[PDB]
Design a protein around this ligand. Structure first.
Ligand SMILES: *C(=O)CCCCCCCCCCCCC
Lengths: 40, 207
């Protein structure tokens, strides 16, 4: 496999059943500023 | 002057698509744009996993300092545009009290791994009691053009944000001769929902 595979990146979201990418902590679950996800 | 160390200020940053309708008619769409005060702080450790590691990576750069050169930019990218007669470009402008030769490295990353790097060398022009540096209409690399195409062909908007969770850009502006970090900007992305492009700028700190 390759982490930098562009097709794999998009396939993971389009076809979740066949996802083969690293598993990550979503940004919204991190210790980040209050308005980090609230646009100005 | 938000994105500013003691030695360099980025006054402008824009990524755009320019479409030539005819020889005298152009349509420009901005994907993202930036154009003294203290900024909100982000614990840099919260984002190390999203950027290159090892020597020359974000941790190594941050530890070497100076601490006031490191920034995190959260972009809401405007993807609402018609995607032979297209030019994808990035423009940026900087100011410094010093006459330097600068190098700008821009690394595109997936899952914190470097995919592509663009490296540009810029010389100073004297301007109104300071020195100005401009990267003018730098061609967007093919990877980024490909990425944008794939994003727009995603059936749903939530899918775009999901992909963008693991897409980052690291910009490191260096004094070519001294290797001092003049600016280091970490970029993270969501897609704009409100109808345009927006941003938050943060200072990166040790804890
Ligand atoms: C190739 O040359 C890589 C250099 C990247 C320049 C940074 C431009 C920022 C791209 C805007 C992201 C919009 C997609 C959501």
């Amino acid at each position: 496999d390759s982490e930098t595979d562009l097709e794999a990146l998009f396939n993971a979201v389009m076809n979740p059943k066949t996802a083969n990418v690293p598993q990550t902590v979503p940004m919204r679950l991190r210790k980040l500023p209050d308005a980090f996800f609230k646009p100005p | 002057r938000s994105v500013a160390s003691s030695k360099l200020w980025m006054l402008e940053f824009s990524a755009f698509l320019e479409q030539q309708q005819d020889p005298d008619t152009y349509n420009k769409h901005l994907f993202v744009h930036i154009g003294d005060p203290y900024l909100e702080a982000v614990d840099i450790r919260q984002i190390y996993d999203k950027f290159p590691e090892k020597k020359g990576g974000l941790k190594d750069l941050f530890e070497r300092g100076p601490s006031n050169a490191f920034f995190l930019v959260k972009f809401w990218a405007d993807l609402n545009t018609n995607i032979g007669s297209s030019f994808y470009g990035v423009s940026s402008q900087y100011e410094s009290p010093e006459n330097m030769i600068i190098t700008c490295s821009t690394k595109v990353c997936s899952f914190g791994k470097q995919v592509v790097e663009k490296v540009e060398t810029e010389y100073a022009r004297y301007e109104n009691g300071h020195y100005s540096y401009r990267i003018h209409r730098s061609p967007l690399c093919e990877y980024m053009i490909n990425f944008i195409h794939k994003l727009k062909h995603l059936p749903e908007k939530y899918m775009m944000n999901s992909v963008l969770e693991n897409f980052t850009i690291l910009q490191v502006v260096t004094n070519r001769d001294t290797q001092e970090t003049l600016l280091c900007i970490a970029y993270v992305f969501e897609v704009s929902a409100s109808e345009g492009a927006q941003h938050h700028i943060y200072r990166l700190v040790k804890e």
